[PDB]
Design a protein around this ligand. Structure first.
Ligand code: ATP
Ligand code: ATP
Ligand code: MG
Ligand code: MG
Lengths: 634, 634
């Protein structure tokens, strides 16, 4: 309380050479405990145990020597933010220190403290011109850095998940597992963005800095409590209320005040998670019902069915807007509580340090410098309930993804049929039985053996087990028993489907489907198209329009016979394959196939009685188990 | 500058009875010009001319007497926010007025102004206890109101758009228009939320108040400039810089300072729109390539095609992350400019009103009350460039939707075939010619006439014009010419498709497809299923699993013959319909159809030569135009 002209808090020279040493002391002692508190979170927390299984291999191994070095700069770019906020309070003390001398020198009649109290006011603006360029050049050097880390996380994670999805035929076997999951188109396109952005339940947009990320919004709000506690601890008073006498009231009041409002802020947003998990599923079972309609547009027009289908969208839409009107009724009562507790504390330090100012105990700088600090350590400890709803939707993005990796791990543990390679050319099978998930019986244990040159046709009933035998002989059906010896290899067992399939790309990839695009010489790609009477498609081989609804269904089978000859297998199975072709061109194709390929074991399924002149054995399924194998004659 | 104890600015009694009259004066004079400035925006602005065509009928007509009454309360709940912010400055003047008397009474030796200067300090907290409950009970009474307006906008708009999509067979004819649009599954599920939320390019989440909406963030930032200009205008000084002498410098400096930084903030974010339109299309042509894979899972397994399809996702993914690394390079240089101009103005009023305080011109209240006002009218005029990027993505949500309503209006202006109702039972056609969009010729102008009891089969070549004639006779194909007389009605011309189709719902809707669910008596729904040998599906009629991949393709045709008999038409066309059934059950079905329905004009397309014993006429297409019509014998 001395009548000296002006006393600055710090010397302001040897201030920058001293504020570099504190950063170097507070970097390492933060990092070597942050790694400990993360490693302690991986083991003993059930929302974080499922985190490491999702994104394991990106952090260990040899390639992760660059990710940690990118991560280690962002801790520096947070300590450098706390160190500026300390000096923004140490500057703001001096204005309210100098403006008391500059006032009372006028009323006291002094002429040497008014002249020497205003020299401090033209000093404290001199700090606010260099501590305000470093604040602007930091934030613009922070948006660019944290926008080049999550890109290299997303572009690796959405490649790691797809290769595990379609690795082991797990894109088909997931429909037979017990606790089935739904619409995996959303867990790759959409819910990898929210999981790797870390912000909320919202995808990232190019303005998210470090201060809006759930991991780095916490370490910034823990360092900024340890650093701002050495100032208030030697500033509070001994408030003697009735009863007991508190030694330091201001520092110990906020610590019990935050704790009561923290526990109440956790038992309100408790079912807030499962109301934000259903909203991402009900708005994904709605967008499937339109994509099923769009590329089925031809068959709905012939039926005039625009009044039944109009009921289904209203039946699948109305539980979305009904599961939103009880989700907005929860996130008002929770958000109305964390506003009514962050307002009724703001005129607190102005009344506990009020009578110590009208008496000469302090000198008007400490009131403002106390208000700035109490409005900082209370807000930075208020991070752990004011950002709870933006953690809830994030925790519904970890369960949603973890239900995919642990659904194609249980997708390959179902039984199948064992295959072994033959020695030269033979298709034999010892015993094969197949069933139905209801628990029926289709085929009894049967036996057959075929050699290099041979043929076989399978006829039977209308819908009693004729494709299921083909679905079980390629390791694609779960309920079966037996073995198989095949002429194995890479592409030596070519199947075809009862319904035709085309790919998505250009016309150069529609004809060479199992092979790649450039592995076929273009000089004789067009020549084999003339052998199957597709002359007017020899041109326009480099178009780009979709071929799903352009070609006829009778034109998608003659292109498959071009797919057979461009791979040259030895164990071709094919069913249907002439559902639209007339008689007169079919056996011409078969006499072409026999004369271009001498020895391929043709195994077919047909209904019209005009193919038995081309096969030497015949298997008939009477349905229910009784089968008969016989050679044909005349 | 009087030495009186304390002078409050307003009387603080008859303050609430006077602050109600100003709200009533500032409500109507705001509304009757806001309607004018909106009506002037509808006509003469090309981003707003397309706005009224999207959402026209929700604002005119008889039902819109409730929407305007819901809208008129939110203007009151914004004027009530500006009127509190005026008094938050009129309160904050009094602290810095009283704390000068309370200081200089200590140094001057006075004992009757120190005692009577501190009584003002225990008055200005008495205002901060009632003007802080009304701030909390307003915001929590504002989140609830604006969350029940956009729900009743979304739940009407996403119903208005779908009924216009599939009204006039415009879900199929859009593939023949000139400037084709893509993936209309996204313009209904996703891009109705951003258009009706009004916030940014982000969907709404249940914490958006009035202060985060592009319409009501502007009227709140125009009233709050007219109201805060009567205070600074009688407070600035006459700053005599070298050269000319400005009469009122502080008020006229900010007005030319915002204008220079506003024009520069518009020529930086100029191509920011078309970089935020491509991001919503490239992340919607990626989510189609997985939904095409998921329900095509059977045919890919037989082909082992997991290496070509793995190239296509990487070919369709990499221009998404490449159209993001030049979008983050634009929204840093723009966002680095509107931060470097909202920082270099903040120590301005502390240095223009500095020497008027160390001399006794003003009395330390006006410095703070000037700083609070200059940090308010500068920020509220800074709304029109600090919220420009969140307008750009919104303007890419109006073009994206307007390309849908103006794409099924041009989707029904294509030519077709004219139909007229017959008198009793007759299918005649005068002349019909059909073509191909390349400009080929399929069928010459032909003629045929059929009566009550009759039949016809159409055979021909492999893929030369046999379904296109059926696609043009139901007003579904654009390139055709001619007329038709039909036995019309509601459901008296039933077609079938060459590929079978099932609906999505339960098993009660898979068999009664053009009719509704409850319009069929359940006592005889099961009895007609026994006539087509579907006995073991008579049970389990109320299941819920999807029937796309459960039934066989040979089982989806015998259920269609149950769809025919449950509607009883007179002019049934059917093609294929026996692609999987063996001989022996087919003519049993036809002799069932002839014996349950006596007179229906059966018109079929078939390839196997076993149906000509059931028809009396026959049309043969030789391909290229030459056709022949003849009766069959033996
Ligand atoms: N974009 C297109 N949309 C529809 N048809 C096309 C298109 N481009 C070409 N076409 C022609 O349409 C014909 C399809 O014929 P249609 O629709 O009658 O099937 P189809 O010949 O009856 O098949 P099938 O005879 O095997 O049952 C093809 O021959 C093809 O030349
Ligand atoms: N969820 C299911 N998945 C697969 N098959 C099922 C399922 N439920 C029942 N099935 C049985 O599978 C049989 C389908 O037979 P398959 O797959 O061999 O077709 P298909 O009988 O060859 O058809 P078609 O003989 O007309 O070509 C049906 O008879 C049905 O009883
Ligand atoms: Mg089958
Ligand atoms: Mg056809």
């Amino acid at each position: 309380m001395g009548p000296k002209l002006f006393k600055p808090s710090i010397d302001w020279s040897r201030a920058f050479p001293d504020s570099v040493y504190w950063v170097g002391k507070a970097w390492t002692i933060s990092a070597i405990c942050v790694l400990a508190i993360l490693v302690l979170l991986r083991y003993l927390t059930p929302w974080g145990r499922q985190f490491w299984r999702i994104t394991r291999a990106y952090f260990v191994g040899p390639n992760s020597v660059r990710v940690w070095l990118m991560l280690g700069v962002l801790l520096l770019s947070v300590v450098l933010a706390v160190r500026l906020n300390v000096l923004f309070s140490y500057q703001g003390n001096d204005m309210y220190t100098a403006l008391q001398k500059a006032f009372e020198g006028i009323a006291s009649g002094d002429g040497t403290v008014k002249r020497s109290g205003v020299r401090g006011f033209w000093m404290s603006i001199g700090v606010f011109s260099v501590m305000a360029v470093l604040h602007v050049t930091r934030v613009m050097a922070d948006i660019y850095l944290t926008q080049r880390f999550i890109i290299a996380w997303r572009v690796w994670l959405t490649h790691h998940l797809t290769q595990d999805w379609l690795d082991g035929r797990a894109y088909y076997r997931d429909l037979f597992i017990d606790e089935t999951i739904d619409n995996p188109d959303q867990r790759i396109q959409q819910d990898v963005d929210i999981f790797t952005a870390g912000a909320g339940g919202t995808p990232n947009a190019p303005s998210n800095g470090t201060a809006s990320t759930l991991l780095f919004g916490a370490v910034q709000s823990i360092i900024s409590v340890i650093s701002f506690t050495a100032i208030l601890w030697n500033l509070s008073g001994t408030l003697n209320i009735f009863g007991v006498s508190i030694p330091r009231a201001m520092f110990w009041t906020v610590l019990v005040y935050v704790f009561v409002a923290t526990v109440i802020s956790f038992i309100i947003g408790r079912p807030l998670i499962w109301l934000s998990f259903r909203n991402e599923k009900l708005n994904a079972a709605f967008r499937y019902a339109l994509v099923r309609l769009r590329d089925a547009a031809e068959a709905v027009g012939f039926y005039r069915g625009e009044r039944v289908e109009g009921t289904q969208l209203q039946r699948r839409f109305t539980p979305v807007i009904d599961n939103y009107r009880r989700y907005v009724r929860r996130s008002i009562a929770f958000n109305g509580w964390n506003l009514s507790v962050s307002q009724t504390i703001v005129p607190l330090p102005w009344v506990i340090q009020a009578p110590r100012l009208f008496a000469g105990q302090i000198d008007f700088g400490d009131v403002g410098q106390t208000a700035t600090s109490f409005g900082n350590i209370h807000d930075s400890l208020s991070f752990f309930r004011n950002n709870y709803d933006a953690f809830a939707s994030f925790r519904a993005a970890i369960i949603r993804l973890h239900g995919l990796v642990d659904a194609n791990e249980k997708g390959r543990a179902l039984p199948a049929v064992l295959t072994r390679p033959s020695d030269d050319e033979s298709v034999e099978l010892n015993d094969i039985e197949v069933r139905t998930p209801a628990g029926d019986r289709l085929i009894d244990p049967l036996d057959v053996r075929l050699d290099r040159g041979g043929s076989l046709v399978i006829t039977g009933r209308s819908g009693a087990g004729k494709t299921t035998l083909l679905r079980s002989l390629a390791e694609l059906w779960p309920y079966a028993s037996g073995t198989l010896h095949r002429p194995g290899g890479e592409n030596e067992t070519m199947f075809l489907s009862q319904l035709p399939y085309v790919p998505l790309g250009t016309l150069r990839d529609v004809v060479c489907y199992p092979n790649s695009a450039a592995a076929i010489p273009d000089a004789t790609l067009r020549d084999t198209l003339t052998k199957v009477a597709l002359a007017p498609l020899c041109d326009r081989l480099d178009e780009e329009r979709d071929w799903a609804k352009v070609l006829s269904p009778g034109e998608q089978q003659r292109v498959a016979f071009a797919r057979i000859l461009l791979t040259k297998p030895k164990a071709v199975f094919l069913d249907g394959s002439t559902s639209a072709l007339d008689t007169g061109l079919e056996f011409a194709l078969y006499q072409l196939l026999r004369s271009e390929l001498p020895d391929c074991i043709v195994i077919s399924v047909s209904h019209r009685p005009a193919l038995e002149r081309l096969h030497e054995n015949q298997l008939e399924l009477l349905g229910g188990g009784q089968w008969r194998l016989a050679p044909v004659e005349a």
